[PDB]
Design a protein around this ligand. Structure first.
Ligand SMILES: C[C@@H]1N(C)c2ccc(Cl)cc2S(=O)(=O)N1C
Ligand SMILES: C[C@@H]1N(C)c2ccc(Cl)cc2S(=O)(=O)N1C
Ligand SMILES: N[C@@H](CCC(=O)O)C(=O)O
Ligand SMILES: N[C@@H](CCC(=O)O)C(=O)O
Lengths: 254, 260
């Protein structure tokens, strides 16, 4: 009767507390999604255990084996009962799992070293001095692979063959490359993470131009889960009480 | 298979009467964002449909006494329509009685003023009484202020609910006209989508001030347990990821803007 929640280490959604080595269970973690999980469980009235996804991935279907990895796979293959994390609502995912109404908005955004002469995605697709890449096994990478839009298709064709790999396993990994590469690398990531980094030291990164798309994160359940309805209503309630806004302010507090 | 009844509402630029509507019939009488959206959705889910303007011209609220739903929500609840394709706001009380797809457009509650009006925030409105302000009836915006426990919004509700004469309007157009005619003495609380649209229409004498008071979206609504729900939801996501929804908003908001 304990609900297994799958989630992922991603600041400021889920982070390890200081001195977590002597802590146990859910008390090991803090962040936006940790608070969110507590509020949902309170409303739906269930006990839950937070577990970090084994592979540290969000969820992608390996075209070769047609096997889902990451948090999506955990739901699909019955390892978890619910995903509470910055998991992007997409078409391919909605085909295999259920999403609640979005609890937070985001768009794919460009992260440049401050001062970098880039103002748009067109600018990136018209230069080769500055490199660019995305996170592996995520919705951002799938966006460019699938985009039949002019600029985005060009950006993808460069990215898929880039040597060495412009793709990273973690968001933190992509952050460093923008910083190290002296303005020769632009990271493609979601505006939420981008806006978060923009506020943190050494404050040398910059969100540039508008978002490339418009979407949201949603709480995910296995298809035909009895938990789905109550969770969706919980999210809506929290939104209308303004609690989602206060959580955003709290963890993106400058 | 049967012709699907679509309930919707005459709200610019979502559903508008074509210039030659009087010599047109069926769905051909109408044009707008939601009309194009309905065509796209129907094509993917492979159904034929008939657009129907909701009888009472309301979005949907539940009578406190009779517990009866009006507007487009009522149409779905009592089985008069199979689907709603309109700027219908996703809310908690509505999700309890009908289903919504994932949102196809984002909005927040915003403030409309006549240009030059000394108001830059909702707190500015709550602090004064010289400038009156209100909302649309039978809609999600009015329910927001009625239900809010946030001090400034509750202060605004306490004012609005007892204001004389009534600061509430029956249509968006009535609300816009009231802003334009009141010489800066009326501000209108409406959804950012509507606000931004009007901002681009002649006489170009209004504007949106401050940030949005909340964050939500419009969704395609179906009766609970409808078999159309899944296909429609998937269709909305597909159109979103193809960039179709962004192109539709550009077409109806800014591609024909009249204020430069
Ligand atoms: C179709 C649908 N769209 C457009 C939007 C729009 C805004 C937000 Cl905050 C979330 C979503 S989503 O993730 O529910 N999905 C992609
Ligand atoms: C909870 C949920 N929230 C926060 C949001 C946020 C952004 C958009 Cl575009 C739509 C919605 S909604 O209408 O699906 N609903 C109110
Ligand atoms: N939120 C994304 C991961 C972040 C990214 O791909 O940039 C997902 O759900 O796949
Ligand atoms: N979109 C609102 C109506 C407009 C408003 O209330 O401002 C609704 O669905 O109730």
């Amino acid at each position: 009767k304990t609900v297994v929640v799958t989630t992922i280490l991603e600041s400021p959604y889920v982070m390890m507390k200081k001195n977590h080595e002597m802590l146990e269970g859910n008390e090991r973690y803090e962040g936006y999604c940790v608070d969110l999980a507590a509020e949902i469980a309170k409303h739906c009235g269930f006990k839950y255990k937070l577990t970090i996804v084994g592979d540290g991935k969000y969820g992608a279907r390996d075209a070769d084996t047609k096997i889902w990895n990451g948090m999506v796979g955990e739901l699909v293959y019955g390892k978890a009962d619910i995903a509470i994390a910055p998991l992007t609502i997409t078409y391919v995912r909605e085909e295999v799992i259920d999403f609640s109404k979005p609890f937070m908005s985001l768009g794919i955004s460009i992260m440049i070293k401050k001062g970098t002469p880039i103002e748009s995605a067109e600018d990136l697709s018209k230069q080769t001095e500055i490199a660019y890449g995305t996170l592996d096994s995520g919705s951002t990478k799938e966006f460019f692979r699938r985009s039949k839009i002019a600029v985005f298709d060009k950006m993808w064709t460069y990215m898929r063959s880039a040597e060495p790999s412009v793709f990273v396993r973690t968001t933190a990994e992509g952050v460093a490359r923008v910083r190290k590469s002296k303005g020769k690398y632009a990271y493609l990531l979601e505006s939420t993470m981008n806006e978060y980094i923009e506020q943190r030291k050494p404050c040398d990164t910059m969100k540039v131009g508008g978002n490339l798309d418009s979407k949201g994160y949603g709480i995910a359940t296995p298809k035909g889960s009895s938990l789905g309805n109550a969770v969706n209503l919980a999210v809506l309630k929290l939104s209308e009480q303004g609690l989602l806004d206060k959580l955003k302010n709290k963890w993106w507090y400058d």
